[PDB]
Amino acid sequence: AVAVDLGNRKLEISSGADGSAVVQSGDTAVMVTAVSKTKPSPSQFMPLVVDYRQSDKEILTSRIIDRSIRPLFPAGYFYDTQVLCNLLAVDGVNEPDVLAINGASVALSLSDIPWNGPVGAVRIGIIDGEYVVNPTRKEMSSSTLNLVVAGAPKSQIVMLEASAENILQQDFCHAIKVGVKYTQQIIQGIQQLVKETGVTKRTPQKLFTPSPEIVKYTHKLAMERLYAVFTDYEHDKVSRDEAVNKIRLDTEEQLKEKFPEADPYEIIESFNVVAKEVFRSIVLNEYKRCDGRDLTSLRNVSCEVDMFKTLHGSALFQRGQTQVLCTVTFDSLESDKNFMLHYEGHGALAEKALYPVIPRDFPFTIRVTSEVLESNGSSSMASACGGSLALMDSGVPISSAVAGVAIGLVTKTIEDYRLLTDILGIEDYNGDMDFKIAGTNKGITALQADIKLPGIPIKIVMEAIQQASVAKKEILQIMNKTISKPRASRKENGPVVETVQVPLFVGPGGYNLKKLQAETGVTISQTFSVFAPTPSAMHEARDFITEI
Amino acid sequence: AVAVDLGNRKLEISSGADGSAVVQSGDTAVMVTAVSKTKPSPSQFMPLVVDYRQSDKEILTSRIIDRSIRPLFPAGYFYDTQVLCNLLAVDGVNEPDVLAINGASVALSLSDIPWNGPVGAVRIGIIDGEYVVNPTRKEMSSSTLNLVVAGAPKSQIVMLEASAENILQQDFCHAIKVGVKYTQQIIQGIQQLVKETGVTKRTPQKLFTPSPEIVKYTHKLAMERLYAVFTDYEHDKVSRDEAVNKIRLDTEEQLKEKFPEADPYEIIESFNVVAKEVFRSIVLNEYKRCDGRDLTSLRNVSCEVDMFKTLHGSALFQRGQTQVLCTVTFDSLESDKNFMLHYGHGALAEKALYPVIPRDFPFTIRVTSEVLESNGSSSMASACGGSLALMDSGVPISSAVAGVAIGLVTKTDPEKGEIEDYRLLTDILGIEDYNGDMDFKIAGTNKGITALQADIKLPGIPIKIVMEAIQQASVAKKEILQIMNKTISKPRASRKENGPVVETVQVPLSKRAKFVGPGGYNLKKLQAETGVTISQVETFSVFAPTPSAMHEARDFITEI
């Protein structure tokens, strides 16, 4: 067993399924196992599945682990891989989710599987201005920041997930730097254990990457036509996708006549490689994007408020070809803060972006519903924008307006890179990261970095945050033109609550009140409290109680 | 690795965590690990959790595995035990849920964890009249029965879960017999693997069962006072529970004085053992239950329909002190049979009503059963109230559905290992389930069986008892249906006047871009104004919660 010092407490790492590991901190210990078949998958991609045990917590944790280990597998490694985490003990103090990410790193590092790690992962909190490493369950209850960082060798950032109570950018960036430093300590522990254990990696049968010969011939056949498409700024999202597909159909029938010995899938990826390189070479060499935008330019943002007159609150935020419609519905407090945002994964990120500005003792449950009408790049950040608008339109006294944006990245391998403000879908697809960050015009509230490269330097993460605040200020200015303060009053059709003291009406088993809510549509509970969606329904409610 | 040949397929069982196992059938393979701590748990029960890998099906499968292995741990085994099932491969043909049950059996049998197995488990389906063991995914789609049975040695049943397409009783009974036969074939395979692997089981620290001395003294203190309570027929649920607790506090105080060295947990269980034995001895010796009822007697059953004015369908079913209130609410289809019941207890009531629900209904059927009073088998009452409410809402169901729970009290010869005498209890109380051996919940129509869930606390019961419990329940089910049909016996010819409406609307391509609007904004703006739901099929289907809402929706559509 090996030990790492992450500030106060420690972290022990051992072995045990192509590879197993146990990560313990305090009296919480997790066991993780990694397997990968030797027969290639018939699906033409890498099927990696992370199974976490502790239920929305499990799914979000499983994907946090997934994002921390995915970019480190070799390309074309199309082999069924399973990473299962089994919680062995929980002390209620040390959280196992961070241990699981590390457990997933050690398992693969000790395993057969080709995995260019190891990865270190810690949480960072801020308790009374103190930067806390892996805060305990109690410390997290009084922390202004919940940040999880997955670090690669040489201080490269693999995964960034954060929720913050509107902390300043300077602390947020300092907290990121702290966490990465500790991830480098953990990797020292892993690498020390792999030499004590003795690890030998297999030689996989075939890394399904296209041969340079087919890639070079595909380049000659499609470069100028692909360059033509990615320099024509009149293309929309669909006309540009279909334009490259027309070039895609003409070239491979030519490719099949040239390389009849080639796998049919090898012909598809060969065009994908060439289409990806042409797309990225334009942003790198000419500093322009496929729609004429430059690296820091937003798409045209417009938004309306109070379009649906019957609902409790409505907004529609439109940024380029990403258009969301958000509604607000107040329900009873009887189903921390009672606030929910629902997407129609994405919802959780938007909900975390608005969570800090939501008031505490609001008389009702606040439910935002973001319906995406058109998708073309990070509609979850659009949901936080539209959610802020619909919250103000409804009368919810939010502390400040929130906005989000996604920053992309196009690197040359890192000899050079381009940071893209407000990426299209195609820029996320052909890019290297999906840097979704939101907050107020004073601070950060949520961050989710979906980095595809085998890690990126701290400098790029810092500049991505700075570039995102510039875009955030512009978005908030457009938003504040539509509405900048929460409506002082809710709509007159808005729900109403009232308290009723009963003299010793509930009937046998509550049949009395089941009948009340069934007929009038109100909601009763306890000094009884009754919630009514409309003042009219409240009138039939007081009609019902007088007969009793 | 040992192979067990069932009828139409074989499964092979392997080894690998105090014990592991791999159960493979076809190219579907499940690995199950079993671990059990050697330090006693701070709690006063047995901490047993089963984690199944694949969600609702993971919860259901985990419970079915739990009922198949829980009754065979020795009493007083208060040690944290974990059974982890992990799916390695799923060929889409052979279902792994039954393979995991067997895995939990093999794993525990190969482990050092005290467990008096092994257990075999199979699925039984009837495909075109032929009884198929462990039917494939394709075979299950055309099966009139999904019966899962787990068997203990000597052809004892430990777990029985079934849903059936209203099949005949003798057909249902025949499947149980077939299933139990194939569980015994699996038990030989596991026993052979045990002798091949070599198994030496642990000696636990302590089995937290009360000593004969303290139990004998407890019996001296409480037997006659408890006997008078359990023969006092005027007691209801709460007054009998209060009288029993009044005797517990006096007795548990004298036990602490006579046994100061006894754990408080040994004092509580001593009284529970004596109260349980007294309760069961009255059923066995006098054939009378603690409410004066006889072994086959129902509680008073009454019910109503159409009590609530606003909902599309409502019903209120009461069985003794068990009262449920059921409602039907029609909703759009885009929100197999498009039928749901919302309450574990809900999936069983849903399975009971499912074969009777008609196909091709215009709206989605949402039944809600709210338990107002619970004193035994609210889940079967929810089935009866769901049948009444659905007939009240005008849903063209094939036949009414009733459900009932059957209890069991046994006396087993200690010189043997067999059951020496038993009494099957009809429509059991809560105290008859807690102090009893079995919660045999079965439901169906006047002519067949739609669902069954047997919660057998004993380490297996003979087939004969299960067959008698099924037949005894059919007598109770017909009595319940006769009372149910006097309130309502036919689905209403029409749904209620304010019921939802669905109509079709054509929009020519010229007005089509303006109707839907950019990204569908205008369609969703109409959904908020009128409370309507619009989906495309140049044809759009419109669902409205009210004929008025449809009227307003058609106006906005005509204005385009």
PDB file of C-alpha atoms in Angstrom, chain A residues 73-257:
ATOM      1  CA  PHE A  73      -6.997   5.573 -24.069  1.00  0.00           C
ATOM      2  CA  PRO A  74      -5.158   5.218 -27.395  1.00  0.00           C
ATOM      3  CA  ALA A  75      -7.018   6.075 -30.575  1.00  0.00           C
ATOM      4  CA  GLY A  76      -8.736   3.247 -32.411  1.00  0.00           C
ATOM      5  CA  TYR A  77      -8.844   1.174 -29.197  1.00  0.00           C
ATOM      6  CA  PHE A  78     -12.204  -0.362 -30.112  1.00  0.00           C
ATOM      7  CA  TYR A  79     -12.346  -2.879 -27.268  1.00  0.00           C
ATOM      8  CA  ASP A  80     -15.224  -3.361 -24.805  1.00  0.00           C
ATOM      9  CA  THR A  81     -14.002  -1.871 -21.517  1.00  0.00           C
ATOM     10  CA  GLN A  82     -15.826  -1.924 -18.172  1.00  0.00           C
ATOM     11  CA  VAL A  83     -14.853   0.002 -15.030  1.00  0.00           C
ATOM     12  CA  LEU A  84     -16.864  -1.086 -11.981  1.00  0.00           C
ATOM     13  CA  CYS A  85     -16.655   0.683  -8.618  1.00  0.00           C
ATOM     14  CA  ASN A  86     -17.799  -1.112  -5.468  1.00  0.00           C
ATOM     15  CA  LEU A  87     -18.105   0.865  -2.233  1.00  0.00           C
ATOM     16  CA  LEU A  88     -16.629  -1.222   0.581  1.00  0.00           C
ATOM     17  CA  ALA A  89     -17.245   1.182   3.484  1.00  0.00           C
ATOM     18  CA  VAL A  90     -18.612   4.674   4.101  1.00  0.00           C
ATOM     19  CA  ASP A  91     -17.845   6.608   7.290  1.00  0.00           C
ATOM     20  CA  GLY A  92     -20.239   9.472   6.516  1.00  0.00           C
ATOM     21  CA  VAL A  93     -17.241  11.845   6.670  1.00  0.00           C
ATOM     22  CA  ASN A  94     -15.055  11.084   3.630  1.00  0.00           C
ATOM     23  CA  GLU A  95     -16.925  11.170   0.324  1.00  0.00           C
ATOM     24  CA  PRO A  96     -16.218   8.147  -1.919  1.00  0.00           C
ATOM     25  CA  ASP A  97     -16.825   9.840  -5.292  1.00  0.00           C
ATOM     26  CA  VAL A  98     -13.320  11.327  -5.366  1.00  0.00           C
ATOM     27  CA  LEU A  99     -11.825   8.017  -4.199  1.00  0.00           C
ATOM     28  CA  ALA A 100     -13.652   6.252  -7.042  1.00  0.00           C
ATOM     29  CA  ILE A 101     -12.098   8.481  -9.717  1.00  0.00           C
ATOM     30  CA  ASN A 102      -8.675   7.703  -8.271  1.00  0.00           C
ATOM     31  CA  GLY A 103      -9.640   4.048  -7.938  1.00  0.00           C
ATOM     32  CA  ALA A 104     -10.487   4.049 -11.639  1.00  0.00           C
ATOM     33  CA  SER A 105      -7.030   5.500 -12.308  1.00  0.00           C
ATOM     34  CA  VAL A 106      -5.123   2.928 -10.248  1.00  0.00           C
ATOM     35  CA  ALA A 107      -7.073  -0.014 -11.666  1.00  0.00           C
ATOM     36  CA  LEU A 108      -6.213   0.957 -15.244  1.00  0.00           C
ATOM     37  CA  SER A 109      -2.656   1.909 -14.253  1.00  0.00           C
ATOM     38  CA  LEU A 110      -2.117  -1.512 -12.646  1.00  0.00           C
ATOM     39  CA  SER A 111      -4.146  -3.272 -15.343  1.00  0.00           C
ATOM     40  CA  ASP A 112      -3.284  -4.798 -18.691  1.00  0.00           C
ATOM     41  CA  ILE A 113      -5.316  -2.130 -20.513  1.00  0.00           C
ATOM     42  CA  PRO A 114      -3.314   0.414 -22.561  1.00  0.00           C
ATOM     43  CA  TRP A 115      -4.072   3.593 -20.609  1.00  0.00           C
ATOM     44  CA  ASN A 116      -1.621   6.512 -20.745  1.00  0.00           C
ATOM     45  CA  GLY A 117      -2.090   7.688 -17.187  1.00  0.00           C
ATOM     46  CA  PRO A 118      -2.036   7.815 -14.306  1.00  0.00           C
ATOM     47  CA  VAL A 119      -4.700  10.347 -13.288  1.00  0.00           C
ATOM     48  CA  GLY A 120      -5.021  12.129  -9.953  1.00  0.00           C
ATOM     49  CA  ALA A 121      -8.312  13.575  -8.760  1.00  0.00           C
ATOM     50  CA  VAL A 122      -9.233  15.710  -5.747  1.00  0.00           C
ATOM     51  CA  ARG A 123     -12.029  17.949  -4.559  1.00  0.00           C
ATOM     52  CA  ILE A 124     -11.421  21.579  -3.616  1.00  0.00           C
ATOM     53  CA  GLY A 125     -13.620  23.567  -1.255  1.00  0.00           C
ATOM     54  CA  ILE A 126     -13.449  26.990   0.375  1.00  0.00           C
ATOM     55  CA  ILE A 127     -14.404  26.981   4.068  1.00  0.00           C
ATOM     56  CA  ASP A 128     -13.965  30.365   5.766  1.00  0.00           C
ATOM     57  CA  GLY A 129     -11.588  31.481   3.024  1.00  0.00           C
ATOM     58  CA  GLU A 130      -9.527  28.296   3.456  1.00  0.00           C
ATOM     59  CA  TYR A 131      -8.748  26.209   0.371  1.00  0.00           C
ATOM     60  CA  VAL A 132      -9.723  22.714   1.519  1.00  0.00           C
ATOM     61  CA  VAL A 133      -8.404  19.552  -0.134  1.00  0.00           C
ATOM     62  CA  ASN A 134     -11.014  16.768  -0.308  1.00  0.00           C
ATOM     63  CA  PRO A 135     -13.434  18.463   2.119  1.00  0.00           C
ATOM     64  CA  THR A 136     -15.349  16.190   4.470  1.00  0.00           C
ATOM     65  CA  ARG A 137     -19.120  15.836   4.256  1.00  0.00           C
ATOM     66  CA  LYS A 138     -19.400  18.422   7.036  1.00  0.00           C
ATOM     67  CA  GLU A 139     -16.939  20.863   5.448  1.00  0.00           C
ATOM     68  CA  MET A 140     -18.809  20.668   2.126  1.00  0.00           C
ATOM     69  CA  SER A 141     -21.964  21.886   3.904  1.00  0.00           C
ATOM     70  CA  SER A 142     -20.314  25.262   4.619  1.00  0.00           C
ATOM     71  CA  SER A 143     -18.121  25.628   1.514  1.00  0.00           C
ATOM     72  CA  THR A 144     -18.534  28.282  -1.177  1.00  0.00           C
ATOM     73  CA  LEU A 145     -17.072  25.981  -3.851  1.00  0.00           C
ATOM     74  CA  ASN A 146     -17.431  22.351  -4.980  1.00  0.00           C
ATOM     75  CA  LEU A 147     -14.676  21.739  -7.543  1.00  0.00           C
ATOM     76  CA  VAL A 148     -13.369  18.368  -8.746  1.00  0.00           C
ATOM     77  CA  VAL A 149     -10.166  18.271 -10.801  1.00  0.00           C
ATOM     78  CA  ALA A 150      -8.680  15.320 -12.682  1.00  0.00           C
ATOM     79  CA  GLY A 151      -4.974  15.875 -13.351  1.00  0.00           C
ATOM     80  CA  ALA A 152      -2.747  14.138 -15.898  1.00  0.00           C
ATOM     81  CA  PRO A 153       1.065  13.954 -15.787  1.00  0.00           C
ATOM     82  CA  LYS A 154       2.964  17.228 -16.204  1.00  0.00           C
ATOM     83  CA  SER A 155       0.140  19.293 -14.668  1.00  0.00           C
ATOM     84  CA  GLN A 156      -2.324  18.693 -17.513  1.00  0.00           C
ATOM     85  CA  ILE A 157      -6.046  19.096 -16.811  1.00  0.00           C
ATOM     86  CA  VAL A 158      -8.301  16.193 -17.808  1.00  0.00           C
ATOM     87  CA  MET A 159     -11.632  16.999 -16.136  1.00  0.00           C
ATOM     88  CA  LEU A 160     -13.124  20.044 -14.415  1.00  0.00           C
ATOM     89  CA  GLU A 161     -16.518  20.003 -12.704  1.00  0.00           C
ATOM     90  CA  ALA A 162     -17.549  22.809 -10.378  1.00  0.00           C
ATOM     91  CA  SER A 163     -20.399  24.473  -8.557  1.00  0.00           C
ATOM     92  CA  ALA A 164     -19.646  27.714  -6.719  1.00  0.00           C
ATOM     93  CA  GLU A 165     -21.682  30.152  -4.637  1.00  0.00           C
ATOM     94  CA  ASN A 166     -20.839  33.057  -6.966  1.00  0.00           C
ATOM     95  CA  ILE A 167     -17.194  33.182  -5.837  1.00  0.00           C
ATOM     96  CA  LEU A 168     -14.791  35.568  -7.537  1.00  0.00           C
ATOM     97  CA  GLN A 169     -12.866  34.462 -10.603  1.00  0.00           C
ATOM     98  CA  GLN A 170      -9.574  34.991  -8.772  1.00  0.00           C
ATOM     99  CA  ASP A 171     -10.387  32.493  -6.014  1.00  0.00           C
ATOM    100  CA  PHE A 172     -11.924  30.061  -8.518  1.00  0.00           C
ATOM    101  CA  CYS A 173      -8.741  30.144 -10.616  1.00  0.00           C
ATOM    102  CA  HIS A 174      -6.575  29.860  -7.514  1.00  0.00           C
ATOM    103  CA  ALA A 175      -8.642  26.871  -6.384  1.00  0.00           C
ATOM    104  CA  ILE A 176      -8.115  25.195  -9.768  1.00  0.00           C
ATOM    105  CA  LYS A 177      -4.345  25.668  -9.441  1.00  0.00           C
ATOM    106  CA  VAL A 178      -4.379  24.224  -5.912  1.00  0.00           C
ATOM    107  CA  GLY A 179      -6.259  21.117  -7.029  1.00  0.00           C
ATOM    108  CA  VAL A 180      -3.979  20.414  -9.980  1.00  0.00           C
ATOM    109  CA  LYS A 181      -0.967  20.592  -7.663  1.00  0.00           C
ATOM    110  CA  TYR A 182      -2.445  17.850  -5.488  1.00  0.00           C
ATOM    111  CA  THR A 183      -3.366  15.729  -8.508  1.00  0.00           C
ATOM    112  CA  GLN A 184       0.347  15.662  -9.338  1.00  0.00           C
ATOM    113  CA  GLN A 185       1.057  14.307  -5.847  1.00  0.00           C
ATOM    114  CA  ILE A 186      -1.400  11.437  -6.360  1.00  0.00           C
ATOM    115  CA  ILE A 187       0.173  10.491  -9.704  1.00  0.00           C
ATOM    116  CA  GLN A 188       3.485  10.153  -7.864  1.00  0.00           C
ATOM    117  CA  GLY A 189       1.757   7.664  -5.571  1.00  0.00           C
ATOM    118  CA  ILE A 190       0.363   5.680  -8.500  1.00  0.00           C
ATOM    119  CA  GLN A 191       3.611   5.585 -10.490  1.00  0.00           C
ATOM    120  CA  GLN A 192       5.410   4.505  -7.312  1.00  0.00           C
ATOM    121  CA  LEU A 193       2.945   1.625  -6.964  1.00  0.00           C
ATOM    122  CA  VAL A 194       3.166   0.462 -10.595  1.00  0.00           C
ATOM    123  CA  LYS A 195       6.897  -0.148 -10.162  1.00  0.00           C
ATOM    124  CA  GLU A 196       6.319  -2.046  -6.905  1.00  0.00           C
ATOM    125  CA  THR A 197       3.537  -4.133  -8.461  1.00  0.00           C
ATOM    126  CA  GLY A 198       5.077  -4.697 -11.894  1.00  0.00           C
ATOM    127  CA  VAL A 199       2.749  -3.871 -14.791  1.00  0.00           C
ATOM    128  CA  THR A 200       2.912  -5.234 -18.347  1.00  0.00           C
ATOM    129  CA  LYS A 201       0.536  -3.967 -21.034  1.00  0.00           C
ATOM    130  CA  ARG A 202      -0.801  -6.130 -23.847  1.00  0.00           C
ATOM    131  CA  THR A 203      -0.268  -5.515 -27.536  1.00  0.00           C
ATOM    132  CA  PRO A 204      -3.828  -5.126 -28.884  1.00  0.00           C
ATOM    133  CA  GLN A 205      -4.676  -6.891 -32.127  1.00  0.00           C
ATOM    134  CA  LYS A 206      -5.450  -3.722 -34.086  1.00  0.00           C
ATOM    135  CA  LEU A 207      -5.766  -0.027 -33.273  1.00  0.00           C
ATOM    136  CA  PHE A 208      -8.497   0.840 -35.772  1.00  0.00           C
ATOM    137  CA  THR A 209      -6.912   4.036 -37.124  1.00  0.00           C
ATOM    138  CA  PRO A 210      -6.953   4.779 -40.870  1.00  0.00           C
ATOM    139  CA  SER A 211      -3.730   4.214 -42.763  1.00  0.00           C
ATOM    140  CA  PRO A 212      -1.772   7.286 -43.932  1.00  0.00           C
ATOM    141  CA  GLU A 213      -2.072   6.154 -47.564  1.00  0.00           C
ATOM    142  CA  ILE A 214      -5.875   6.286 -47.539  1.00  0.00           C
ATOM    143  CA  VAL A 215      -5.768   9.501 -45.498  1.00  0.00           C
ATOM    144  CA  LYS A 216      -3.393  11.163 -47.979  1.00  0.00           C
ATOM    145  CA  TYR A 217      -5.472  10.128 -50.998  1.00  0.00           C
ATOM    146  CA  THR A 218      -8.639  11.259 -49.212  1.00  0.00           C
ATOM    147  CA  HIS A 219      -6.967  14.627 -48.618  1.00  0.00           C
ATOM    148  CA  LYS A 220      -6.149  15.155 -52.302  1.00  0.00           C
ATOM    149  CA  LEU A 221      -9.710  14.180 -53.246  1.00  0.00           C
ATOM    150  CA  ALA A 222     -11.598  16.337 -50.737  1.00  0.00           C
ATOM    151  CA  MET A 223      -9.355  19.131 -49.409  1.00  0.00           C
ATOM    152  CA  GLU A 224     -10.297  21.956 -51.774  1.00  0.00           C
ATOM    153  CA  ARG A 225     -13.996  21.036 -51.706  1.00  0.00           C
ATOM    154  CA  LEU A 226     -13.965  20.817 -47.903  1.00  0.00           C
ATOM    155  CA  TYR A 227     -12.003  24.069 -47.701  1.00  0.00           C
ATOM    156  CA  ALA A 228     -14.665  25.598 -49.947  1.00  0.00           C
ATOM    157  CA  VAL A 229     -17.468  24.603 -47.568  1.00  0.00           C
ATOM    158  CA  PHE A 230     -15.674  25.808 -44.425  1.00  0.00           C
ATOM    159  CA  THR A 231     -14.992  29.225 -46.002  1.00  0.00           C
ATOM    160  CA  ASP A 232     -18.581  29.824 -47.200  1.00  0.00           C
ATOM    161  CA  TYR A 233     -20.192  31.825 -44.397  1.00  0.00           C
ATOM    162  CA  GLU A 234     -23.744  31.612 -45.785  1.00  0.00           C
ATOM    163  CA  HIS A 235     -24.002  27.988 -44.637  1.00  0.00           C
ATOM    164  CA  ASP A 236     -26.380  27.231 -41.784  1.00  0.00           C
ATOM    165  CA  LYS A 237     -25.979  24.270 -39.422  1.00  0.00           C
ATOM    166  CA  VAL A 238     -27.822  21.857 -41.727  1.00  0.00           C
ATOM    167  CA  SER A 239     -26.700  23.119 -45.138  1.00  0.00           C
ATOM    168  CA  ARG A 240     -23.056  22.852 -44.036  1.00  0.00           C
ATOM    169  CA  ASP A 241     -23.491  19.353 -42.609  1.00  0.00           C
ATOM    170  CA  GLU A 242     -25.135  18.217 -45.845  1.00  0.00           C
ATOM    171  CA  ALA A 243     -22.514  19.989 -47.971  1.00  0.00           C
ATOM    172  CA  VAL A 244     -19.657  17.987 -46.450  1.00  0.00           C
ATOM    173  CA  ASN A 245     -21.809  14.866 -46.790  1.00  0.00           C
ATOM    174  CA  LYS A 246     -22.224  15.449 -50.521  1.00  0.00           C
ATOM    175  CA  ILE A 247     -18.427  15.685 -50.733  1.00  0.00           C
ATOM    176  CA  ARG A 248     -18.434  12.622 -48.491  1.00  0.00           C
ATOM    177  CA  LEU A 249     -20.488  10.531 -50.935  1.00  0.00           C
ATOM    178  CA  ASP A 250     -18.517  11.476 -54.061  1.00  0.00           C
ATOM    179  CA  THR A 251     -15.086  10.758 -52.566  1.00  0.00           C
ATOM    180  CA  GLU A 252     -15.439   7.283 -51.042  1.00  0.00           C
ATOM    181  CA  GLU A 253     -16.824   5.578 -54.122  1.00  0.00           C
ATOM    182  CA  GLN A 254     -13.617   6.971 -55.607  1.00  0.00           C
ATOM    183  CA  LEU A 255     -11.781   5.650 -52.535  1.00  0.00           C
ATOM    184  CA  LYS A 256     -13.286   2.168 -52.883  1.00  0.00           C
ATOM    185  CA  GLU A 257     -12.077   2.025 -56.493  1.00  0.00           C
TER     186      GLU A 257
END
